[PDB]
Amino acid sequence: NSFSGYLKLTDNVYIKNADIVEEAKKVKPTVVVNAANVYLKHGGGVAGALNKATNNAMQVESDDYIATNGPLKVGGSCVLSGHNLAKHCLHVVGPNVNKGEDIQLLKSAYENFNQHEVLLAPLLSAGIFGADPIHSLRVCVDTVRTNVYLAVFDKNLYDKLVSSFLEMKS
């Protein structure tokens, strides 16, 4: 946990414009969050990017987990190996609002973060799943009480997130 270059938004939320995988390799974090689906299929996005960097070790361990325990709940989580990227990997499932999943569960999904004192995380539901990233950052800041280090990959999205957060801040 040697996080460098993060802007601090609140007492426990930090943000940085980085690739979450490059971040993980460099910082070797205790916990890296994966933006997961219910069957733990890491195709594309953060999940696929992380899986590739373990040369598909993650996807194999994931598939064994689903086979034993069945799908995760939307808004739920499971802790697996972090492989070469971290000690552990917390797969957290946020609502796919694009497919009509309840946006309320984004808050339950962020509540999983509070079981770890330090995390390297992306924004849940803010890509393929279609939530407003500003909304997702807002619920993260309102929900997570532990120290979360957000890697936002796209520069324009990151700029807009730090702007909007600080304009609406109180």
Ligand SMILES: Nc1ncnc2c1ncn2[C@@H]1O[C@H](COP(=O)(O)OP(=O)(O)OC[C@H]2O[C@@H](O)[C@H](O)[C@@H]2O)[C@@H](O)[C@H]1O
């Ligand atoms: N390499 C990356 N590094 C950092 N942030 C990233 C990266 N790739 C995407 N992001 C950002 O992380 C946030 C989450 O994007 P997704 O990974 O698409 O997350 P989510 O919306 O929860 O999508 C879940 C779905 O995506 C699939 O990969 C996954 O298997 C599941 O089906 C968004 O802001 C997105 O721009």
